[PDB]
């Protein structure tokens, strides 16, 4: 599906998030009434 | 499907997000009533 | 499908997002009532 | 080769379905 | 090769379904 | 190779469904 790879020799701040898959999920950034 | 690769010798701030796949998901950035 | 590759010798801020594929998903940036 | 780089990124939005984004930038280089 | 880099990132939003993002940037390099 | 890097990250938001993000950045490099 996806062979992701991050390779950093020198990283001041290394942030990495991996999600296997998203199925039937409603993702909303900002919501207002 | 996708052979992604990020290679940085020197990164001040390295941010990497990997999602295997999105299936049947309603993604909305900004929502207003 | 896609052999993506990002190669930076020196990056102040390195941001990389990889998605395997999007199937049957309604993606909306800005939504208004 | 040699390169003096000064970058100022503000309000950077990365990702699928990016919503409202606002940004104000100002440069006073080589002054 | 040799590179003097100065980066200033503020308000960086990364991810799916990014909402309201605001940012103000200013550069006074080489002054 | 040789590289002098100075990064200043503030208000970095990483993840799915990122909401309100604000950021102010300023650079005074090479002055």
Numbering used by the authors:
A (entry chain E), B (entry chain C), C (entry chain A): 43 to 75
D (entry chain B), E (entry chain D), F (entry chain F): 44 to 74
Published text:
Numerous pathogenic D10 variants have been reported, including the first mutation to be identified, p.S59L1. To assess this, we solved the structure of S59L D10-NT fibrils to 3.06 Å resolution. As expected, residue L59 in this structure flips away from the tightly packed position of S59 in the PF interior. This results in a different PF fold and packing arrangement. Interestingly, S59L fibrils are no longer symmetric, with each PF adopting a different fold. S59L PF-A adopts a fold similar to the WT PF1, except that the beta-helix connecting strands 1 and 3 is disrupted by the flipping of residue 59. S59L PF-B, however, adopts a completely different fold, likely driven by the fact that the WT arrangement could not be maintained with the bulky L59 at the PF interface. The S59L mutation resulted in greatly enhanced D10-NT aggregation rates, as measured by ThT fluorescence. Furthermore, NMR spectra of this mutant prepared freshly in solution exhibited dramatic signal loss in the region corresponding to the fibril core, suggesting that intermolecular interactions are greatly enhanced for this mutant, consistent with its faster aggregation rates. For S59L D10-NT, we obtained two 2D classes that closely resemble those observed in the sample that led to the S59L D10-NT structure, with similar populations.
Mitochondrial proteins CHCHD10 and CHCHD2 are mutated in rare cases of heritable FTD, ALS and PD and aggregate in tissues affected by these diseases. Here, we demonstrate that the low complexity N-terminal domains of both D10 and D2, as well as the full-length proteins, can form amyloid fibrils in vitro and in vivo. Structures of D10 and D2 fibrils assembled in vitro from the low complexity N-terminal domains of each protein show that their core comprises the most highly conserved region between the two proteins. For D10 and D2, the central conserved VAV motif forms a beta-strand that is associated with the protofilament interface in all the structures we have observed, suggesting that it may be a critical element in fibril formation and may be expected to appear in ex vivo structures as well.
